[PDB]
Amino acid sequence: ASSSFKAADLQLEMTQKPHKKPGPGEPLVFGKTFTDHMLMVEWNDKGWGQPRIQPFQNLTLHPASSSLHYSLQLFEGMKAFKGKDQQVRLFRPWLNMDRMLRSAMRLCLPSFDKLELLECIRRLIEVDKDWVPDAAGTSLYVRPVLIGNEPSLGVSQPRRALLFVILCPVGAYFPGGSVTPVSLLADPAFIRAWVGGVGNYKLGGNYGPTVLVQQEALKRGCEQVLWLYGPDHQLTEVGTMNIFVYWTHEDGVLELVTPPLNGVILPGVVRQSLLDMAQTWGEFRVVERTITMKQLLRALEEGRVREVFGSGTACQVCPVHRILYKDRNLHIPTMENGPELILRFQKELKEIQYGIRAHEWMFPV
Amino acid sequence: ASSSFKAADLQLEMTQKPHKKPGPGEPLVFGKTFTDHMLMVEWNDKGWGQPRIQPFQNLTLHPASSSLHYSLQLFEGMKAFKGKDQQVRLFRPWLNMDRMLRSAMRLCLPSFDKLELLECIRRLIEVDKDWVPDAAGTSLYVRPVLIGNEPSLGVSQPRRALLFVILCPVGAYVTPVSLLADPAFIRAWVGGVGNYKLGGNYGPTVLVQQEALKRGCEQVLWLYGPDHQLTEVGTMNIFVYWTHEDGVLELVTPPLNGVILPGVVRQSLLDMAQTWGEFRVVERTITMKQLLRALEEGRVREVFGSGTACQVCPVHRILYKDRNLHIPTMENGPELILRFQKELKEIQYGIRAHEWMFPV
Numbered sequence: 001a002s003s004s005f006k007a008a009d010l011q012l013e014m015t016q017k018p019h020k021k022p023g024p025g026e027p028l029v030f031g032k033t034f035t036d037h038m039l040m041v042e043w044n045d046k047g048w049g050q051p052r053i054q055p056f057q058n059l060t061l062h063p064a065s066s067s068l069h070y071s072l073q074l075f076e077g078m079k080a081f082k083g084k085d086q087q088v089r090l091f092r093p094w095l096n097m098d099r100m101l102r103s104a105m106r107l108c109l110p111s112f113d114k115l116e117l118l119e120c121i122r123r124l125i126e127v128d129k130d131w132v133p134d135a136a137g138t139s140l141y142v143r144p145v146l147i148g149n150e151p152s153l154g155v156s157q158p159r160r161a162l163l164f165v166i167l168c169p170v171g172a173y174f175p176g177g178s179v180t181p182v183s184l185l186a187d188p189a190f191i192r193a194w195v196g197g198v199g200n201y202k203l204g205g206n207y208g209p210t211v212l213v214q215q216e217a218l219k220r221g222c223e224q225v226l227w228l229y230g231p232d233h234q235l236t237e238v239g240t241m242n243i244f245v246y247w248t249h250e251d252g253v254l255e256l257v258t259p260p261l262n263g264v265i266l267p268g269v270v271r272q273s274l275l276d277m278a279q280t281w282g283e284f285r286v287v288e289r290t291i292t293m294k295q296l297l298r299a300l301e302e303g304r305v306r307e308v309f310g311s312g313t314a315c316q317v318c319p320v321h322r323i324l325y326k327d328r329n330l331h332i333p334t335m336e337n338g339p340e341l342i343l344r345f346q347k348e349l350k351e352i353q354y355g356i357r358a359h360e361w362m363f364p365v
Numbered sequence: 366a367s368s369s370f371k372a373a374d375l376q377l378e379m380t381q382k383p384h385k386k387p388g389p390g391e392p393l394v395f396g397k398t399f400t401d402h403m404l405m406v407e408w409n410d411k412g413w414g415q416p417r418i419q420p421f422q423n424l425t426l427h428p429a430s431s432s433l434h435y436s437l438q439l440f441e442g443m444k445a446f447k448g449k450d451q452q453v454r455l456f457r458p459w460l461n462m463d464r465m466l467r468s469a470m471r472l473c474l475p476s477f478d479k480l481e482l483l484e485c486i487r488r489l490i491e492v493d494k495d496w497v498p499d500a501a502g503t504s505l506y507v508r509p510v511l512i513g514n515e516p517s518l519g520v521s522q523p524r525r526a527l528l529f530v531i532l533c534p535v536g537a538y539v540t541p542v543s544l545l546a547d548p549a550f551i552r553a554w555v556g557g558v559g560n561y562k563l564g565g566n567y568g569p570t571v572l573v574q575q576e577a578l579k580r581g582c583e584q585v586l587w588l589y590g591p592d593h594q595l596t597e598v599g600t601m602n603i604f605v606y607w608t609h610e611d612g613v614l615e616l617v618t619p620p621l622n623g624v625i626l627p628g629v630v631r632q633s634l635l636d637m638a639q640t641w642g643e644f645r646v647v648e649r650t651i652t653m654k655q656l657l658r659a660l661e662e663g664r665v666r667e668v669f670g671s672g673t674a675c676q677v678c679p680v681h682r683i684l685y686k687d688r689n690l691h692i693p694t695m696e697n698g699p700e701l702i703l704r705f706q707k708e709l710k711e712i713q714y715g716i717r718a719h720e721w722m723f724p725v
């Protein structure tokens with residue numbers, strides 16, 4: 001018993017003022033450059049309306065829209081890569097569709113068919129193929145969004161909603177192969193999410209309270225925030241990335257560990273891919289288990305820690321070299337291990353994402 | 366002064382297509398009906414633009430507006446009451462202005478001068494005075510809102526923002542409510558943002574409120590900790606009038622520990638009760654164990670919620686997991702509830718002169 005919204009029904013309108021691309025690899029600050037078209041689907045009493053694809057344009061919302069009063073909003077983030085030159089592929093889009101639908105049900109927003117949305121996104125990206133860069137480490141960021149849109153102040157299940165997708169060409173997250181480490185502020189006073197909360201869904205509500213904390217991290221000399229949880233001070237996620245630790249655990253076994261999906265952390269697509277990939281190799285233990293600051297401190301001085309990094313769509317595998325804890329700067333030996341594992345993960349993903357290696361994880365055009 | 370828009374700069378555009386005021390039938394559903402005008406002020410690199418009272422109209426937002434991607438949004442809720450004379454008064458608006466500014470700083474949104482916003486709100490209400498109902502227990506609900514509005518996908522401090530205010534005539538709200546108290550749902554946490562009126566606090570409650578209904582309750586009593594403590598109920602702070610374990614008669618309400626929204630009505634009930642001096646008034650943690658045990662022992666007199674929508678709201682039942690708990694509120698006259706309600710109406714409708722009220 002559930003909705004619809006079909007891809008066979010798209011309508012099409014092309015831009016009369018096709019904006020001009022970034023040119024050489026120089027500008028494009030992430031998220032501030034948009035392509036010529038966008039996807040838009042409306043839902044109401046008559047259910048889902050028809051998809052289509054229109055020129056990039058402003059939204060028109062009633063002043064009481066629940067999307068602005070009660071944060072009835074959720075989003076996704078995924079990437080399209082252009083490799084064999086002009087051939088464009090989406091990395092594991094199905095997982096983002098699965099996650100988006102779960103976020104929708106948590107916020108009582110309308111359900112939709114994951115494959116139809118994926119096909120409309122495919123159609124949209126097709127129209128803006130030329131916006132997809134092909135220089136090393138660049139890609140096209142895809143931002144689907146679903147918002148409640150009830151022109152009513154009652155806190156309740158909306159009877160109207162809007163789904164849209166916009167695209168941004170992105171530069172190489174790292175200047176040029178320059179994989180550079182980041183420093184993290186790890187302060188227990190800051191709490192991103194709670195057990196029983198909504199940290200495991202991609203809801204706008206989870207992000208707004210982090211702006212002030214990120215500003216604090218900069219003022220204290222760090223680049224991102226390492227979110228801690230519990231009296232235990234466990235490591236949950238870093239910034240907008242899941243966190244991984246490669247070290248010789250306390251029982252002498254070499255392992256790659258990452259916090260488990262206990263409800264407080266976001267099930268990252270890159271996170272799942274690194275786990276899958278490492279399990280496949282079978283060269284060392286790969287496990288999902290709780291990581292505490294106390295365990296990290298001990299391992300660091302017995303020189304048991306090899307590499308620590310974050311994973312996410314923006315920055316696939318991100319080295320960490322320093323963590324400021326309790327006034328405490330902890331040097332993380334990641335780079336002196338020449339991010340061997342980090343480097344290996346990056347290479348495999350590049351080969352897969354840019355079509356060098358055929359793989360089911362990729363979705364065509 | 367630099368850092369704020371000014372009431373003296375107000376530009377105003379009267380409507381050329383009035384709405385029909387709520388007809389005779391009189392069915393006033395909350396937040397469903399809007400008056401003719403709204404307030405709008407923009408902020409950016411050049412800072413605050415000039416305030417504007419304009420016809421009620423849609424907002425035009427860039428698809429990447431941070432208000433829609435990262436919930437850079439907050440709001441307020443307060444009421445204007447029209448008394449016998451026909452004079453309109455705002456109830457303790459300064460507290461809402463203070464709370465709105467605290468919410469803005471928490472979300473790195475632009476600061477503004479509280480008195481200037483209050484004056485523009487005063488001017489907006491004046492324009493739409495004809496919308497302020499005057500039948501018993503009716504009022505005009507005021508909804509200021511401040512949202513981030515940078516056309517960028519980066520999660521960061523916006524360089525653009527929009528502040529607007531819309532008004533709704535409200536038709537009323539006695540009768541007790543039932544509450545669902547289930548530990549599985551967590552609304553806010555220590556170190557979180559439950560003490561700010563941010564839209565992000567509300568969206569996740571929709572599903573839970575739907576669950577409360579399918580379970581036969583009308584609202585949600587939010588619990589927190591192993592420590593099943595009572596935080597707030599629905600969109601109201603929660604109060605308990607009883608004889609405590611120490612056998613002393615008191616009025617208790619959970620403390621402002623970051624744990625909950627500092628309600629304006631809540632602060633007013635505390636002030637008023639403290640003033641009377643007839644019984645102990647305190648801010649302390651309240652646990653389900655203590656409640657269960659106080660009920661068991663007939664020490665509980667009245668339990669109620671407080672909030673702008675429903676000033677003092679009697680509670681008669683709480684479903685705690687399987688456990689339907691009857692709350693003796695109505696059989697104890699809501700004696701304290703009635704006295705609070707009596708006093709607030711006299712103050713809010715101008716029967717009794719008071720500093721809590723702000724003119725027109």
Ligand SMILES: CC[C@H](C)[C@@H](NCc1c(COP(=O)(O)O)cnc(C)c1O)C(=O)O
Binds near residue numbers: 241271311314519
């Ligand atoms: C502005 C967009 C969001 C910051 C963002 N999400 C990535 C994310 C991740 C990584 O998830 P994936 O990109 O799906 O692998 C993990 N944890 C949190 C709290 C996150 O926010 C992104 O799309 O990059």
Ligand SMILES: CC[C@H](C)[C@H](NCc1c(COP(=O)(O)O)cnc(C)c1O)C(=O)O
Binds near residue numbers: 597602630631674
């Ligand atoms: C639907 C009503 C609005 C959300 C609103 N605040 C009510 C409220 C309150 C009570 O605050 P007051 O209205 O200021 O007394 C307490 N806790 C929560 C979680 C609330 O939402 C208001 O001031 O109208």
